[PDB]
Design an enzyme around this catalytic site. Structure first.
Site, PDB file in Angstrom:
ATOM      1  N   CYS A 156      38.485 -29.205  22.776  1.00 26.64           N
ATOM      2  CA  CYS A 156      40.537 -29.437  22.855  1.00 26.64           C
ATOM      3  C   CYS A 156      40.095 -29.621  23.965  1.00 26.64           C
ATOM      4  CB  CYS A 156      41.279 -28.389  22.419  1.00 26.64           C
ATOM      5  SG  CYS A 156      42.917 -29.202  22.933  1.00 26.64           S
ATOM      6  N   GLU A 172      41.261 -40.596  17.587  1.00 29.08           N
ATOM      7  CA  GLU A 172      41.246 -39.344  15.813  1.00 29.08           C
ATOM      8  C   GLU A 172      42.020 -40.496  15.359  1.00 29.08           C
ATOM      9  OE1 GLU A 172      43.165 -35.445  16.663  1.00 29.08           O
ATOM     10  OE2 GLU A 172      44.191 -35.990  18.157  1.00 29.08           O
ATOM     11  N   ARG A 197      44.568 -29.889  27.027  1.00 29.10           N
ATOM     12  CA  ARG A 197      43.987 -28.476  27.152  1.00 29.10           C
ATOM     13  C   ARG A 197      45.244 -28.779  28.828  1.00 29.10           C
ATOM     14  NH1 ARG A 197      38.999 -24.810  26.799  1.00 29.10           N
ATOM     15  NH2 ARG A 197      38.889 -27.212  26.587  1.00 29.10           N
TER      16      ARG A 197
HETATM   17  C1  HEM Z   1      48.817 -31.413  23.473  1.00 31.37           C
HETATM   18  C2  HEM Z   1      48.371 -32.327  22.775  1.00 31.37           C
HETATM   19  C3  HEM Z   1      46.977 -32.505  22.447  1.00 31.37           C
HETATM   20  C4  HEM Z   1      46.273 -33.162  21.965  1.00 31.37           C
HETATM   21  C5  HEM Z   1      45.827 -34.990  23.205  1.00 31.37           C
HETATM   22  C6  HEM Z   1      44.975 -32.677  21.251  1.00 31.37           C
HETATM   23  C7  HEM Z   1      43.672 -33.416  22.163  1.00 31.37           C
HETATM   24  C8  HEM Z   1      42.831 -32.730  20.718  1.00 31.37           C
HETATM   25  C9  HEM Z   1      41.535 -33.480  19.745  1.00 31.37           C
HETATM   26  C10 HEM Z   1      41.033 -34.895  20.398  1.00 31.37           C
HETATM   27  C11 HEM Z   1      40.799 -32.635  19.439  1.00 31.37           C
HETATM   28  C12 HEM Z   1      39.564 -33.481  18.624  1.00 31.37           C
HETATM   29  C13 HEM Z   1      40.419 -33.810  17.288  1.00 31.37           C
HETATM   30  C14 HEM Z   1      38.788 -33.723  16.132  1.00 31.37           C
HETATM   31  O1  HEM Z   1      38.540 -35.194  16.362  1.00 31.37           O
HETATM   32  O2  HEM Z   1      38.993 -33.116  15.122  1.00 31.37           O
HETATM   33  C15 HEM Z   1      41.038 -31.594  19.309  1.00 31.37           C
HETATM   34  C16 HEM Z   1      41.063 -30.251  18.856  1.00 31.37           C
HETATM   35  C17 HEM Z   1      41.465 -29.486  19.454  1.00 31.37           C
HETATM   36  N1  HEM Z   1      42.612 -28.707  19.508  1.00 31.37           N
HETATM   37 FE1  HEM Z   1      43.695 -30.137  21.198  1.00 31.37          FE
HETATM   38  N2  HEM Z   1      44.904 -31.688  20.939  1.00 31.37           N
HETATM   39  C18 HEM Z   1      46.293 -31.263  21.279  1.00 31.37           C
HETATM   40  C19 HEM Z   1      47.149 -30.104  21.047  1.00 31.37           C
HETATM   41  C20 HEM Z   1      46.632 -28.215  20.356  1.00 31.37           C
HETATM   42  C21 HEM Z   1      47.461 -27.686  20.668  1.00 31.37           C
HETATM   43  C22 HEM Z   1      48.711 -27.132  19.936  1.00 31.37           C
HETATM   44  C23 HEM Z   1      46.575 -26.747  20.567  1.00 31.37           C
HETATM   45  C24 HEM Z   1      46.628 -25.217  18.983  1.00 31.37           C
HETATM   46  C25 HEM Z   1      47.566 -24.689  19.396  1.00 31.37           C
HETATM   47  C26 HEM Z   1      45.207 -27.039  19.839  1.00 31.37           C
HETATM   48  C27 HEM Z   1      43.994 -26.813  19.059  1.00 31.37           C
HETATM   49  C28 HEM Z   1      42.698 -27.059  19.338  1.00 31.37           C
HETATM   50  C29 HEM Z   1      41.171 -26.550  18.645  1.00 31.37           C
HETATM   51  C30 HEM Z   1      41.605 -25.140  18.463  1.00 31.37           C
HETATM   52  C31 HEM Z   1      40.598 -27.830  18.425  1.00 31.37           C
HETATM   53  C32 HEM Z   1      39.010 -27.616  18.117  1.00 31.37           C
HETATM   54  C33 HEM Z   1      39.713 -27.346  15.994  1.00 31.37           C
HETATM   55  C34 HEM Z   1      37.839 -27.996  15.449  1.00 31.37           C
HETATM   56  O3  HEM Z   1      36.969 -27.486  16.044  1.00 31.37           O
HETATM   57  O4  HEM Z   1      37.858 -28.701  14.649  1.00 31.37           O
HETATM   58  N3  HEM Z   1      45.315 -27.953  20.037  1.00 31.37           N
HETATM   59  N4  HEM Z   1      42.564 -31.511  20.206  1.00 31.37           N
HETATM   60  N1  LIG Z   2      34.481 -29.329   7.957  1.00 32.73           N
HETATM   61  C1  LIG Z   2      34.866 -30.251   7.357  1.00 32.73           C
HETATM   62  N2  LIG Z   2      35.084 -32.186   8.071  1.00 32.73           N
HETATM   63  C2  LIG Z   2      36.104 -31.624   9.008  1.00 32.73           C
HETATM   64  C3  LIG Z   2      37.054 -31.327   9.257  1.00 32.73           C
HETATM   65  C4  LIG Z   2      37.737 -30.819   9.551  1.00 32.73           C
HETATM   66  C5  LIG Z   2      37.222 -31.396  11.296  1.00 32.73           C
HETATM   67  C6  LIG Z   2      38.015 -31.295  12.944  1.00 32.73           C
HETATM   68  C7  LIG Z   2      39.050 -31.535  12.431  1.00 32.73           C
HETATM   69  N3  LIG Z   2      40.703 -30.837  13.105  1.00 32.73           N
HETATM   70  C8  LIG Z   2      41.532 -31.570  12.580  1.00 32.73           C
HETATM   71  C9  LIG Z   2      42.409 -31.570  14.133  1.00 32.73           C
HETATM   72  C10 LIG Z   2      42.433 -30.586  15.177  1.00 32.73           C
HETATM   73  C11 LIG Z   2      42.825 -30.388  16.439  1.00 32.73           C
HETATM   74  C12 LIG Z   2      43.419 -30.895  16.515  1.00 32.73           C
HETATM   75  C13 LIG Z   2      43.969 -32.973  16.236  1.00 32.73           C
HETATM   76  N4  LIG Z   2      44.045 -33.402  17.013  1.00 32.73           N
HETATM   77  C14 LIG Z   2      45.126 -33.107  17.531  1.00 32.73           C
HETATM   78  N5  LIG Z   2      45.821 -33.658  18.271  1.00 32.73           N
HETATM   79  C15 LIG Z   2      45.929 -31.744  17.386  1.00 32.73           C
HETATM   80  C16 LIG Z   2      46.609 -31.160  15.986  1.00 32.73           C
HETATM   81  C17 LIG Z   2      48.055 -30.522  16.464  1.00 32.73           C
HETATM   82  O1  LIG Z   2      47.273 -30.517  17.912  1.00 32.73           O
HETATM   83  N6  LIG Z   2      46.965 -30.871  18.218  1.00 32.73           N
HETATM   84  C18 LIG Z   2      42.949 -33.124  14.884  1.00 32.73           C
HETATM   85  C19 LIG Z   2      36.022 -31.877  11.614  1.00 32.73           C
HETATM   86  C20 LIG Z   2      35.321 -32.032  10.224  1.00 32.73           C
HETATM   87  C21 LIG Z   2      33.911 -30.827   5.662  1.00 32.73           C
HETATM   88  C22 LIG Z   2      32.704 -30.258   4.796  1.00 32.73           C
HETATM   89  C23 LIG Z   2      32.328 -30.411   3.881  1.00 32.73           C
HETATM   90  O2  LIG Z   2      33.017 -31.558   4.480  1.00 32.73           O
HETATM   91  N7  LIG Z   2      33.116 -32.197   5.196  1.00 32.73           N
HETATM   92  O1  LIG Z   3      42.547 -36.183  13.887  1.00 29.05           O
HETATM   93  C1  LIG Z   3      41.342 -35.819  13.418  1.00 29.05           C
HETATM   94  C2  LIG Z   3      41.204 -36.760  12.409  1.00 29.05           C
HETATM   95  O2  LIG Z   3      41.604 -36.773  11.280  1.00 29.05           O
HETATM   96  C3  LIG Z   3      39.679 -37.169  11.720  1.00 29.05           C
HETATM   97  O3  LIG Z   3      38.773 -37.033  13.147  1.00 29.05           O
HETATM   98  C4  LIG Z   3      38.445 -36.124  11.536  1.00 29.05           C
HETATM   99  O4  LIG Z   3      37.170 -35.468  11.960  1.00 29.05           O
HETATM  100  C5  LIG Z   3      37.521 -36.337  10.242  1.00 29.05           C
HETATM  101  O5  LIG Z   3      37.168 -37.918  10.848  1.00 29.05           O
END
Ligand code: HEM
Ligand SMILES: N=C(Nc1ccc(CCNCc2cccc(NC(=N)c3ccon3)c2)cc1)c1ccon1
Ligand SMILES: OC[C@@H](O)[C@H](O)[C@@H](O)CO
Ligand code: HEM
Ligand SMILES: N=C(Nc1ccc(CCNCc2cccc(NC(=N)c3ccon3)c2)cc1)c1ccon1
Ligand SMILES: C[C@H](O)[C@H](O)[C@H]1CNc2nc(N)[nH]c(=O)c2N1
Ligand SMILES: C[C@H](O)[C@H](O)[C@H]1CNc2nc(N)[nH]c(=O)c2N1
Ligand SMILES: OC[C@@H](O)[C@H](O)[C@@H](O)CO
Ligand SMILES: [Zn+2]
Lengths: 411, 411
Positions: free
Chosen positions: A108, A285, A111
């Site tokens: 993330c 994103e 953070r």
């Molecule tokens: C406050 C503004 C926030 C921004 C700008 C932000 C930004 C991001 C971005 C760009 C990602 C990558 C997501 C992806 O590419 O799929 C991410 C992942 C993640 N965020 Fe942050 N986020 C925010 C808030 C939060 C909050 C409120 C939480 C939890 C309470 C959180 C927990 C996580 C987690 C656990 C991931 C990893 C998800 C994964 O492994 O698929 N985020 N965040």
């Molecule tokens: N798992 C598969 N795809 C797949 C599924 C999920 C992911 C990760 C996507 N997390 C979405 C995510 C997580 C955390 C933050 C954000 N964004 C914010 N800004 C935010 C949202 C809330 O707070 N902050 C978005 C990546 C790939 C799959 C399996 C088989 O085929 N596809």
């Molecule tokens: O905010 C997360 C967006 O939905 C994408 O980055 C997913 O990871 C799948 O493309």
């Protein structure tokens, strides 16, 4: 006592926090798996160390480590894990564990905001209708008329395993995906299995592009139920460009509120399978991944067409050119509507500034470079040049299987 | 028997090659160091297993594993390591080890070309003048009038450690870096220490920007000596844009031939400290890193100025916009001059195609995602979506300290 360097600034930071890490990364001394996407009921023997560890750092946090209230609370939880083979968190312990799960989320980049989080205790919930009510209250609060605010809503912890609260949506707000007779896909191809599960459960699809999905809410392990979020609570940003007027005619829009719902929140060894958390978007994103992944909306073809670009050759960088324009448009649109969004430069700078804080007032910051580095203009952002130690600290957000793969149905 | 996935194509590949890996990554089960930039005389006891391992796979390669010539060659090397506590490679073993060091280079996206490599055996060399002669022959050959060809030039192996052949330049062709009275830097800030070492050794600098440096060549551990590469052998591409005529007035240019010289080539436990290798550029190393790293030429300020861009705000993506234009210009310029260059889309596609081959006809392909993913438009390239196992196979290219940090001088 490991060292991480920044090669753009020559700043060096020392990491001793990784020593407190406990769980495994997937890597060994002879193989690095830092680019594998997913890295792979609990007894009462296993539960007390996890409660002990958690409670020791929570009391250490409020500058009351070891005092009377600590020893009483250890004894209290110890006794209750004997009596029930689980236990219950204080409202304060629940808010600490949540904020700290986010704090430890190493993928993330947002953070720096980890302490400003609103925790909604939904552990009194018993029904899908009660879930629906809690989620709508989340969306309304977090959306805050475009001045977005971070929040999480925590439903009852897993107990046996067959009575699990789950939100079957990946995100509270996701656009539908429908396939076609000609194999193409309308809407979001990412969600096509889930869109059809909803149709399988009687959803009545408006079969267009940006169709907000219904919630599918599973309560106490029962079969899940459909609820359409009132549309007045669904803030949407139509995407225009600050130069290209034909960009409006593209007819794109995204929702303001990213709100992940399919993750598992772990606190002191207690598992919350329903814990939707929301913040705000980094611009990339939407503009890069959502809009331009080949297996997502995949709009580089059409933006490059209207931009009048040399698309014959790979080496014209027409994909790159339309990718910058698209992200200029998402940011510009979100900002003109006073809806919170961060650009990948500002986001990554703040994360370096956050990194300094965590190494100073905490001795480290777990960070996953593969996920921290934004998906465009990587090396003009300061995190490209920043070494990052990845390790797994708890409290934490974990992945979990999709409910329809694990749910014993009976209905 | 580990599995890597591609999430854009759902292609899955199985890796058994990592089992043959031997050396350590820096990572443990509880900490991933996949984003640390650098990961940290030999006795005759240590040398035979390394010769044995190498020779066993070289004979296994030409479909003659274990036969007479193999057992003789093991005995032959064994005997010679008794007699001298080192040994000497066959011309064929030297060409196999070189090509395979490149093949195993896990940070290299160009490896689909690993078998088309020209090995120049310079192990008869004894003097800096002899080194100069070999290098010029390398440059002339590899440059090939812009139709670039891959090559490596291998100088005598380290023996004792105090008689080391070294090329003190990082790359055979690098532009000079001079600091100024006002603290600013003219030329390439990357090379300022090396530019002053040359001036310290009597170089006569033309103190401008794109000043090709002289070679500093150390032979048999002696003090190194200066030699100016004849400029007719130094191919240079002046950078123009296919739209913006003011781009010529920017007055930029790069050299055609990337030729790394500061690395250590390890083959069967034998160390070559002087082994310059050359291929051709991916466009991004010039347009993105060279030209736009803040601590390099750092031209985003000036290109964005001339592009008439909103530079007030971070969120205008003016840096991103000028970054795509700059890389369009490097590619366009190199291609119009018939000088070999690859774009980051074509390069990354070929590397997926290469990855398929290595997993099929070799059971795996070590790959460093942090380095494989190009530094702009990461996720519109197919390697972003490709999981990669990183592990260390030998023969290999290793980093080594700079000679002026290790050289006992005496002159
Ligand atoms: C406050 C503004 C926030 C921004 C700008 C932000 C930004 C991001 C971005 C760009 C990602 C990558 C997501 C992806 O590419 O799929 C991410 C992942 C993640 N965020 Fe942050 N986020 C925010 C808030 C939060 C909050 C409120 C939480 C939890 C309470 C959180 C927990 C996580 C987690 C656990 C991931 C990893 C998800 C994964 O492994 O698929 N985020 N965040
Ligand atoms: N798992 C598969 N795809 C797949 C599924 C999920 C992911 C990760 C996507 N997390 C979405 C995510 C997580 C955390 C933050 C954000 N964004 C914010 N800004 C935010 C949202 C809330 O707070 N902050 C978005 C990546 C790939 C799959 C399996 C088989 O085929 N596809
Ligand atoms: O905010 C997360 C967006 O939905 C994408 O980055 C997913 O990871 C799948 O493309
Ligand atoms: C043929 C065309 C080639 C292309 C397009 C190519 C491409 C690249 C690129 C873009 C990098 C990253 C460099 C950086 O960002 O610093 C790299 C690294 C590397 N290349 Fe290749 N390369 C080519 C040829 C070669 C050859 C001929 C060799 C060896 C004989 C080689 C060995 C390596 C090694 C060892 C690295 C890692 C260097 C490090 O860790 O700093 N490459 N290559
Ligand atoms: N080590 C520092 N910087 C630093 C130094 C070096 C690097 C790696 C640069 N390798 C250059 C390189 C290697 C391999 C391939 C290419 N390109 C080709 N296409 C090619 C060239 C020949 O064949 N193919 C380029 C990265 C950072 C440092 C220390 C203190 O401060 N800075
Ligand atoms: C193969 C690779 O691990 C995969 O594409 C990862 C790379 N980095 C990422 N980074 C973010 N923020 N989100 C992602 O989905 C991914 N996907
Ligand atoms: C901190 C980080 O490891 C460092 O910036 C790396 C990242 N990836 C890279 N990738 C390539 N190809 N070249 C580089 O110099 C780097 N630098
Ligand atoms: O071809 C390599 C380029 O010179 C740069 O990427 C260096 O890594 C330093 O910026
Ligand atoms: Zn690792």
């Amino acid at each position: 006592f490991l060292k991480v360097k920044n090669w753009e600034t020559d700043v060096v930071l020392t990491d001793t926090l990784h020593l407190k890490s406990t769980l495994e990364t997937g890597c060994t001394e002879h193989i690095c798996m830092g680019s594998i996407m997913l890295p792979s009921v609990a007894t009462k023997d296993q539960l007390f160390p996890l409660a002990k560890e958690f409670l020791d750092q929570y009391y250490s946090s409020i500058k009351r480590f070891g005092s009377k209230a600590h020893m009483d609370r250890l004894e209290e939880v110890n006794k209750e894990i004997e009596s029930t083979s689980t236990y219950q968190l204080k409202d304060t312990e629940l808010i600490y564990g949540a904020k700290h799960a986010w704090r430890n989320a190493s993928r993330c980049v947002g953070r720096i905001q980890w302490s400003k989080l609103q925790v909604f205790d939904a552990r009194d919930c018993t029904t899908a209708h009660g879930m629906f009510n809690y989620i709508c209250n989340h969306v309304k609060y977090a959306t805050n008329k475009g001045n977005l605010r971070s929040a999480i809503t925590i439903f009852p912890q897993r107990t046996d395993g067959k009575h699990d609260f789950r939100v079957w949506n990946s995100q509270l707000i996701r656009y539908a995906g429908y396939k076609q007779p000609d194999g193409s896909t309308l809407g979001d191809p990412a969600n096509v299995q889930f869109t059809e599960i909803c149709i399988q459960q009687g959803w009545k699809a408006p079969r267009g592009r940006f169709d907000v999905l219904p919630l599918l809410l599973q309560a106490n392990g029962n079969d899940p139920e459909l609820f359409q979020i009132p549309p007045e609570l669904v803030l949407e940003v139509p995407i225009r460009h600050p130069k290209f007027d034909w960009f409006k005619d593209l007819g794109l829009k995204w929702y303001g509120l990213p709100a992940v719902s399919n993750m598992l929140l772990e606190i002191g060894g207690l598992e919350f399978s329903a814990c939707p958390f929301s913040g705000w978007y980094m611009g990339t994103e939407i503009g890069v991944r959502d809009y331009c992944d080949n297996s997502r909306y995949n709009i580089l073809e059409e933006v490059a067409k209207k931009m009048d670009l040399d698309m014959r050759k790979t080496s014209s960088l027409w994909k790159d050119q339309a990718l910058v324009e698209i992200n200029i448009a998402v940011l510009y649109s979100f900002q003109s509507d006073k809806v919170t969004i961060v650009d990948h430069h500002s986001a990554t700078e703040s994360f370096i500034k956050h990194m300094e804080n965590e190494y100073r007032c905490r001795g480290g910051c777990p960070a996953d470079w593969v996920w921290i580095v934004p998906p465009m203009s990587g090396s003009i952002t300061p995190v490209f040049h920043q070494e990052m130690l990845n390790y797994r600290l708890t409290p934490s957000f974990e992945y979990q299987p999709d409910p329809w793969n694990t749910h014993v149905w009976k209905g």
